[PDB]
Design a protein around this nucleic acid. Sequence first.
RNA 1: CUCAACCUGAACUCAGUCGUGAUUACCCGCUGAACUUAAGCAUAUCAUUUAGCGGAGGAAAAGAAACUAAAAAGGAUUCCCUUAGUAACGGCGAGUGAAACGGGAAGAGCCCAGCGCCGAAUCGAUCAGUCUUUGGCUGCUUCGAAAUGUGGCGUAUAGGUGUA
RNA 2: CGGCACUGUUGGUUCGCUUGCUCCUUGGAGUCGGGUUGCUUGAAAGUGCAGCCUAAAGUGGGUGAUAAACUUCAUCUAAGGC
RNA 3: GACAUUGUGAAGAGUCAGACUCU
Lengths: 104, 204, 203, 121
Amino acid sequence: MSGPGIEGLAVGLNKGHAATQLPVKQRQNRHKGVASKKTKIVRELVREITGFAPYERRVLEMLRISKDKRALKFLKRRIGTHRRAKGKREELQNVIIAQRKAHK
Amino acid sequence: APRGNQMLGNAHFRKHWHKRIKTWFDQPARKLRRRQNRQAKAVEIAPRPVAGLLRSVVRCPQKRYNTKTRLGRGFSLQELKAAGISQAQARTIGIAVDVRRTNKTAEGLKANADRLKEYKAKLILFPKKASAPKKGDSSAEELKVAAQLRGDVLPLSHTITFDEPRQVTDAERKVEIFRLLRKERADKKYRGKREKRAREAAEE
Amino acid sequence: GAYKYMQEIWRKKQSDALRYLLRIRTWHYRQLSAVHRVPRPTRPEKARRLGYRAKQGFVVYRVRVRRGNRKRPVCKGQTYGKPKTHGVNELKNAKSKQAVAEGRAGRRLGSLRVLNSYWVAEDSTYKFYEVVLIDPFHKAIRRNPDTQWITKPVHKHREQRGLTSAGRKSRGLGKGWRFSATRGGSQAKNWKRKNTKVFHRKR
Amino acid sequence: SAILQKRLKVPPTINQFRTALDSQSARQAFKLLDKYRPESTEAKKNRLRARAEARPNTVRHGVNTITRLVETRRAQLVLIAHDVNPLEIVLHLPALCRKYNVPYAIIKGKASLGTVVRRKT
RNA sequence: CUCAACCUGAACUCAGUCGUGAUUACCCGCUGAACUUAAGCAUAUCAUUUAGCGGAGGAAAAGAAACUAAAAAGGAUUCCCUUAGUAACGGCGAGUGAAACGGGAAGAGCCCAGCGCCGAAUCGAUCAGUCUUUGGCUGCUUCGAAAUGUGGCGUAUAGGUGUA
RNA sequence: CGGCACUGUUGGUUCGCUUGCUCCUUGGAGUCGGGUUGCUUGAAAGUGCAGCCUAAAGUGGGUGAUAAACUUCAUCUAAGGC
RNA sequence: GACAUUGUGAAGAGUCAGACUCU
């Protein structure tokens, strides 16, 4: 902290030359990534039309039997990455919940 | 067969280097060619400055250089807005625009804003049609003084200044500078371990 | 619009509908010649995205390319060298199958200019690509100031010079330390620059 | 190819295009549609010189236009050609219309619809 | 079974175009050795190089960040000096081996698909006028391309509506 | 023979452009990613390229040079073009 | 040998809880 004998530190968690921060505004290029409402509707409709892939069906059966670990391992092997496998497993679990609520 | 005390050879000449040889016998010729190109460009775009667009003031990225400043690619949109110049107006007036650069600090923004203001003050604008001048357009006796500028536009100054002598204060003298530096280093080094200990204590 | 729906549907290649359609289309493609003019693009949305326009002067061909590695063309696998060069079988071509298909189309049609290509089907033996080409001398192309660029001499045989989108993929171009090997626009040019012995005038 | 299409099992979303409007309903639909055919070439010729000297209801066409109309719930009836090739061009229209509660029918003949619209298909 | 559409595919000494083959100094994409060095030799080296194939221009290619980085930050591509025989690779042997920051030459930005609005407002031949006719401008000329969508606005710096 | 600057004249063309406020809106798939194989690099638990298998998502995706989870962030916006 | 090309039905056995695996 600036004071007698200190004008700024070159090391430590408080290192840095003193400066005044402007408010942060998200750049335009940062917006890419968010689905629009129309895009979400399109994706839901295309899902309803086309259906599921064979590995998605196998994971659905695994989740039905409540083998979350086996489903995660299978999705890791197929999709490839832990992050993507977790995302796909969450989506398929949501599908399981929706089917249960609709039927029973 | 190296003999005696020698520095072990290191020459990289085991490739067919005779096929790739570059000489510099045309250095003065290239110098003259670039001078001639500059003269031709000056004639083509007179009375506009030969250097071309005006460039911004920048701070060198790394801490090894961050005490220096240099010319940039252009002026950020924030800088243009602060100086009251549109991007299109800057383009037609001859100011470089850096569409990628963004300002995160008031001091850096203000330095370039002042640079833009000074350039606008020094600018001379000729009538679009010589017969009929318009608003913002420079006056006739101003246009009579117009001359082509050579070299960088608004060149930077690299002179170093020495702080005025002052008095040594007791508050300054009482600080333990080495202990302060070591304390900062220790705090940064052991931050995470202390957080882990605090979390474990909270769980207990 | 409908184009978003076409894109999303085509993204689901394992669905029953697209599986059936691909089965039918692959069977149909297998019965035709290796390079064959097609009346209209099979994937209009993809063609539009790559730069196709339903205008006189744009044509579409279908190219079939055999899959697998590139066997080294030597007699009885005889290499006549050190063991490091004895490989004959597990050698992979430097250009992708799509680039090979684009090159075949461009070679066959020397009077046109290859613009782009896209995937349409595949089986264990063949891969099928549809290549969009432009006639650089049709007036509908020459008088349009947007497509006038491809009607210039410097754009002859882009697919033989590796300038199309697919061809560029194999050249390792890019920005950053990952793609530093091709500074100057080509690996060969960068290597020449790095390995040239420079003799300054005064030294 | 025709034999193979008959022989292979067709998923429902593809098979839905095989069952089109019966002959009588299709005739009624075309009778209604022909009342709003776009402006003819002869009509355009006659209108051009009159306008130089000096937009009713019409059938809309084009998958993008029809998709926008359906999504905006502005179309009252939609007729989808049963033989669109590639089929992915219109593979979404039945479901989209059923989702937006727009009456829709798969009718026989993209060429017939193009004739109604003064086009090829 | 008659006639009429579309789709797909043909034949034309049909009307008008276009490609082929050369050149090697430089340029772009592939293919790809061994002599040699390691005092032997197989990885390694020679070398991502002789040789072979293809493709352009007056320059080519690259090019407007899915970048560098971790400052109080830089800001397309190309090229020079320096970084530097350095980080790194290597029977860690012989040997090989960059880049950013920094100083300079030159510096110029942009267009689509998609979403959305207008929705055929777009375009090629042919005919007839007209001109400054080895090409241009006008059309109730006649055909055709185009709704499986040509053109206009518009692309990350966003963009658009309305409004001052 | 070219290049310029100014005058005349022929043809075409211009409801735009900037800044403030208001509301609406905003994107590339057999591609990315993963496994394995081969080549390549100074790139070292994979720098670049390609074959086969697998195969996405939507504040998602890529990157931050030692691999993996859980965490702070920073920085861009790939798979289209001049 | 595995994966893909590879689709449509039956019977048996085994896993489960209508599916999978095999022959």
